[PDB]
Symmetry: D2
Subunit: 462 residues, 4 copies
Amino acid sequence: WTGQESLSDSDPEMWELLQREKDRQCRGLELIASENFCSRAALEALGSCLNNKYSEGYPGKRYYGGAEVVDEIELLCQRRALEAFDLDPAQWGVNVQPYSGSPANLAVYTALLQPHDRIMGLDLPDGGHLTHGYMSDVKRISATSIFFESMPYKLNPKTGLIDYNQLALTARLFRPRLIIAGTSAYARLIDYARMREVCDEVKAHLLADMAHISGLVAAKVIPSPFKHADIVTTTTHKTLRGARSGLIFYRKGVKAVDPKTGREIPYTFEDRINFAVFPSLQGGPHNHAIAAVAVALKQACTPMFREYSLQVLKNARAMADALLERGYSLVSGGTDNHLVLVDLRPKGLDGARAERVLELVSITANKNTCPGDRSAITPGGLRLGAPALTSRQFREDDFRRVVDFIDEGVNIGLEVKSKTAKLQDFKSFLLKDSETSQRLANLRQRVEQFARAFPMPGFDEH
Amino acid sequence: WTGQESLSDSDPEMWELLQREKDRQCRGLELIASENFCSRAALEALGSCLNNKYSEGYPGKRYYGGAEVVDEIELLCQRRALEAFDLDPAQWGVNVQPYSGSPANLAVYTALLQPHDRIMGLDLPDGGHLTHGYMSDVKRISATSIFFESMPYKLNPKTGLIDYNQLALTARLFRPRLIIAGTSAYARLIDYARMREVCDEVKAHLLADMAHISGLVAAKVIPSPFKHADIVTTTTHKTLRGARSGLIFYRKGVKAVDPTGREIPYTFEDRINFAVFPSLQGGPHNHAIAAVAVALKQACTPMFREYSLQVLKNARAMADALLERGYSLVSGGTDNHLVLVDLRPKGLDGARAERVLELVSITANKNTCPGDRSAITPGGLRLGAPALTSRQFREDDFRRVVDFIDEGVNIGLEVKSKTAKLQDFKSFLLKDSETSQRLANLRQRVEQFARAFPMPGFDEH
Amino acid sequence: WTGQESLSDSDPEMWELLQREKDRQCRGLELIASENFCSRAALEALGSCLNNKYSEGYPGKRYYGGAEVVDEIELLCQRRALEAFDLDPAQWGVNVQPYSGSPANLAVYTALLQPHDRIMGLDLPDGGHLTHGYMSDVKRISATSIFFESMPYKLNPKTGLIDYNQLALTARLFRPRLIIAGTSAYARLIDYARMREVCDEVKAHLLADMAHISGLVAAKVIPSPFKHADIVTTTTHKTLRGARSGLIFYRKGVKAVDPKTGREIPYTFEDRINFAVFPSLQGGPHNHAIAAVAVALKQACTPMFREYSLQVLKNARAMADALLERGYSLVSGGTDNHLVLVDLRPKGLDGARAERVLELVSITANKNTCPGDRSAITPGGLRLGAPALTSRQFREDDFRRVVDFIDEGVNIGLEVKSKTAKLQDFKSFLLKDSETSQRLANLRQRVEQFARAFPMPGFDEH
Amino acid sequence: WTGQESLSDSDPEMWELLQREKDRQCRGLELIASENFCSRAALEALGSCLNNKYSEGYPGKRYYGGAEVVDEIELLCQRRALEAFDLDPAQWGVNVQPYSGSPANLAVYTALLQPHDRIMGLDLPDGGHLTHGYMSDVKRISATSIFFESMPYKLNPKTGLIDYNQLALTARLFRPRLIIAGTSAYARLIDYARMREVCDEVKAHLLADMAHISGLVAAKVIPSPFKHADIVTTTTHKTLRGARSGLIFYRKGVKAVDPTGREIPYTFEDRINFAVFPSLQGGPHNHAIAAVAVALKQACTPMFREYSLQVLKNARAMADALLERGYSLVSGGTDNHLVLVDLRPKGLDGARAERVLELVSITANKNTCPGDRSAITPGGLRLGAPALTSRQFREDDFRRVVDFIDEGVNIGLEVKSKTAKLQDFKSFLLKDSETSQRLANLRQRVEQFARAFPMPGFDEH
Ligand SMILES: Nc1nc2ccn(CCCCCc3ccc(C(=O)N[C@H](CCC(=O)O)C(=O)O)c(F)c3)c2c(=O)[nH]1
Ligand SMILES: Nc1nc2ccn(CCCCCc3ccc(C(=O)N[C@H](CCC(=O)O)C(=O)O)c(F)c3)c2c(=O)[nH]1
Ligand SMILES: *Cc1c(COP(=O)(O)O)cnc(C)c1O
Ligand SMILES: *Cc1c(COP(=O)(O)O)cnc(C)c1O
Ligand SMILES: *Cc1c(COP(=O)(O)O)cnc(C)c1O
Ligand SMILES: *Cc1c(COP(=O)(O)O)cnc(C)c1O
């Protein structure tokens, strides 16, 4: 045994499974807003010898030896990270060691806050992520809610966007030490300046969780939260089109002046953020992911990537305006970023019913809770994203077509919800009813044949 | 732009770095015991299309859709996770989604324990990990020591082993809810039966953090902590020779019969999984999860049975070689993949030997010894057989590795006679062109010896 | 030494100090809303041999012996407590061991809640007590805020009373487990049914801190929170006119039915409340205070006590309507209980300035934060109470006179605030300025000579 | 209605109870060591006009007004609090507002420690108080064990003393922020110098909870914990013979000189006071605060010097009497006011002797012994000299108290030969008219002996 055998000539059970997921990725229309296809240049460094390296610590301050080469990859990933977002290395640092998006946020709380200190983050069914703190009125779901006390701020259920005033009201009563301006299902921009006004008012911290919009900020197509936020976290997938990892952008340098001494008051963010990642929470960094990220950060400071993000924005509206003009309402009026919040309630169906139908014809989205919803097991609305398919060189006409696929798929279950009872009934007929079974195999063949001829990034075979 | 351009063309600055580390791994003797060389088959799955698949949830109970294939992968990994450790699927479950070993341990604590519940783990200078609760004399270091209250147990310095008698005495006053039977710098076998008794007495859970010995347990060359623990965390790298991920083995099914006849169940499966997701993590790194399942399939094969059994013979060969050269070994010798060396007799300290051996491409790490306070320059080295054994090293090769080490020791010994402080020491190695030469001739001799050995994984990166 | 010597023939330094406080109590107009004069029948049991008895535990379940007589005093204080508030001993219990008002509340949180569980209580400057949780936007003041996370609910600064809607808003976001409907500076009643609606809505507990209004509830003159609250705490002084102690009224019996089994679901309040007091928080009960309380609870179920509370209510309005018709505004319109919230802002002065002036002429009140206030060191408004002087057999004409004393005292500092700068200046002139020094010695002589001829309760000499 | 009617007229039901307890106190032998008889002068201040004075704050810094007189009282109490323990007013402050001893201890913890910080106190079955953190095998009992994490230290069962060597060994692993040097059922002197060294080594605060020995310390008949502790909590009852309240003595002024020359201060005065109010308590019980100052003035007088010195001679007289009658004393004897008795040799258990002695008006309490688990019927009694010594008891009187005790022991011994369980035992004492007689003749003999002794306080209530 040499360890250099192929994955095919050794483990075929896994190799066929790899190609099936590749075929499934290629034959399908991926509309998960947080999904995206990675470049082969990044995947090559992901499956590299850098996986065989323990580099616990930070460059110049390891607790081992032989970290001489990985110290140049972190210090480069750090440079490329600040490069991609136009950040002076005198006002900003970055921690490239977070394993993913959730471990990145958990490190920031652990760094700045104390256990059970107060946190405000957008409520989860109001388009938030659970890493912002999610208590389910029965049990504490996210570890953010367990180790720290979290109170959510909500949407205005009429306007459909962030109630910057009720949040500006609760912060004075709740006196939090950290407010998280970041989303996972919200189709508008965010005023990262009213948040900073609320944060400066209640002496809190403004954390920017710019995941989902990571690339749009790097390509300068939407406003950058670094203008008025002091700590910015993000993942490396979603939009930045890299491998699965996380980042923590913290502001360094000088905070202000001693108005009566003239002494320098420094930003004390750095050494706390760096300490929380290691040694507190993590151990051996995934250096093979740091490289695959630095690769994707390089190809993010490039004009090729701005054309990508601009197409992503244009493909969002071209999916919204197409969906608007077909019998569908758009939460928050329409969109302003990469994803759209479809409301299926003014259409007689829901995200839970449409998904399973759409999921069965190689079109992948997810359910979503809209303001105009009534429960949880049947949420009214879907989450549709652009960056996934735009990487296959999708255009406005290419997206107005999958809308014609969606509406041609929504109106398949719409004749079954009017013919069956609940979710367990809905899905049951979709699999044996030959009038609907064969009705799906037509759309699946039409969806696969349409999508499979688009240039998928990454390796050809896996 | 297609996203199918190679890295060698798209980004040369990074591609030139993959070769600098691939050469450094190929040209150096790797003795960091927590380090192994992942196979090419597993590394292929690491950089696969699975990086583009958000599959939040668990096979079946998943939030999104389209996980029809990655469900079969995670279910194949869960199947191969148990077969490697000979676990009955009706008595054991496994969570294959921990991003690494540290997030695996934090998931167990978050699942079973409320915040500020009590955990006991071996002290860090005594051989324990950070994730077993390390608390400095002034600050809370590990996050386990922050969201939970931790008290460590110590070695018996006279024997270098875990003092299972002081643990039992201290665990009755501290009354923890979880005691951890995992180590990093421990050259001996853990008395898991003695641990469970203590955990039983004080109504606590026994956690086995077998990250260092996971491959030895899988090949059944050492006793298995599954026979005495009910929660087993492990890393998929190290002695398992896989991609960087973590696994949580737990018990399920009938706990015991009620004294009535009621069937008391196990309550790990649902708390453990809920802690990993949605509580702590999120999108499962489906590429590592698949790359892990490749390494697990190898661990079920006789090649691993011979590899792991060779890892033991090479540690003894490394241990006996140091002993015959007048080296003190903590606990006298070794029963696994590790060899703890005590350099205080020979006259050097681990901080100096780590620098010299590093300059000749012999990667080890300094280790504290039973006795000297943590506020002291360490007088010990931690050596590991897993890495080079994957490069087909054998018994006669580690006696040579010890020979190269001893020549490196006698250099820092000569330099220590010439150097005063430590920061001065790390300059005399780089400036004094008489010792700068001596290190170059040992570096070259070492690299020539190492390059001739095969390296698992890709050839160029 | 026999231990039976008099306090005079042994410690005269303390005896003269005792009589001076007695003379100070008699010669002055006490307007602290939480103060009151105790009956000699209670003070006799307070300084009794019951101080020499350790009775840790509860009747029938002591951990000593010889508690045979104190077991009959607790079981009687328990009976008299439920008697005074018309409570069926099958639906209600009481813990008579709380040392005071603050230790009573701290026991209820410790009993029902977990550390860092969530608590909502009326904000302190909005007429609350700190035992409801008071964080000062810098440090955690009350131990309620340290051991549990507290978020306050505020007053409507226009209406001047409890914003039952903004509280009904925050409870859904904050998801507390306990809301405290009790006041220390609020002149209206409290809807102990909208609170219970908010508590049943967010699955919280309704704690009634009926201190300040303890006697008014016992005399049936104002609504009783026991109608819709499940845990009721109170002190024994303030209105109930007893010794310094506390009480914890908890509901026992059956909570509801198992609608699918018919089994009894019991109120699990009792054994937690009893356990938190002993052994958790306290040790040896002050049996000499339990007796002095049971004495005052006896003389509270009597028609003599209803005449008292009715005079207290009538003396409040007769102080409000008198203050209204003299150039003073009343927060919350007027009053509805025992105390009035004077607003000195529409009069050019404040509670901090008036107090020190009033305090210097044997008239004792305190500062108070009204909604229409601008800071903290100079709060605009005073807190005036009835139960203190009403125990000296005060009538409406007797209270309209001290208002004529107050307004004749307010307009003494009103010529000094218009002649001095801040608080440190204000008080400084009051002590050397012979034009104001002698101007006070006239009012002090007129206040002392007026008040000293009223029947003070308690011992004649101390 | 004037509020000046006497209790004898206003409420007879309660007045008839003040006499039933006054008679029971006068007619019984009081051996509950935490129990003394308050003087009449202090009891006069207890039921005074000061109960009608809300004086929130501290002398000067007070919220309300009109506290011009109660300020002089609290300042007189603070002056007499220090003079009783010979404390320099420039080195020590005192908070005289704790409602009792338990709220006094909680104030110290809340002031100095953050929630879930670590406290070490003597175990409750070993002699410690609840407020030193008692944590059952299943539940958190004391509130100290809830808002803080507590680990107890134990006695050395071979010697009955505190094992100061296991404390130092366990305090290095637990690393507490506060160690408590207070006891309830401890018949010996605490090595406060050995405690402070341990607190110094692990960077912890030494708390002295001298509630039981406060009067002995005030009279300088035993070593003073102020000479080694920096926070001293105490009750104003027990050996101090005052009303029920608690005091917190702390250090202030210069801590030490900085190694520079900076003057490092003490940070207790402002944290301690803020914890008592506004953090924890509210309206100071000004009646107890004044009644305390009367008891403190007595503690500065030679009468207390003779009273406390007599309390010691009477405990030895009680100890030596039990020894000469074949009784086992925990730790062999006594050095204070207490005498711990071990009834396991004689054949009875503390739960049975407490019932028999209670039925003859000899009030003691059962005490666990070094050895038997807390889940066992206690085989020991706790006896105290403070109470009866206030009734002018002397050495020859306690030998008689032991004689009355021994006759009571031999009754339960005869009953134990006749009784099986314990709930049966407490019925055979009440039904069997042959033993019902035997207890009546001992009860009468005891009460006649006791009534002849004077009783501090009022005559009728
Ligand atoms: N037996 C055993 N061997 C190994 C080999 C590698 N590891 C993995 C972890 C390496 C060391 C953990 C660590 C990492 C960082 C610090 C650290 O930052 N300390 C102070 C901060 C205190 C202050 O700021 O006061 C400082 O340096 O500033 C530490 F104190 C220990 C282990 C292991 O975990 N256990
Ligand atoms: N050395 C020493 N002597 C004395 C003499 C009096 N005291 C003062 C305190 C008396 C005992 C403390 C206490 C008080 C109550 C319990 C108690 O409630 N236990 C369980 C609850 C557990 C469950 O419910 O599982 C139960 O009975 O139900 C206890 F377990 C100990 C002391 C002292 O503190 N120390
Ligand atoms: C998706 C997301 C995360 C978590 O990403 P993971 O890789 O699953 O950890 C965190 N924050 C935001 C805003 C996200 O959208
Ligand atoms: C290596 C190791 C871990 C995990 O380290 P990570 O790099 O975070 O995966 C956990 N416990 C022990 C004992 C280990 O050796
Ligand atoms: C005054 C008050 C208290 C506290 O009374 P204390 O005797 O000082 O402990 C508690 N709750 C309320 C509503 C109060 O008015
Ligand atoms: C008696 C005592 C206390 C206080 O008990 P309380 O009745 O609450 O005042 C505290 N510590 C010790 C050691 C005691 O003996």
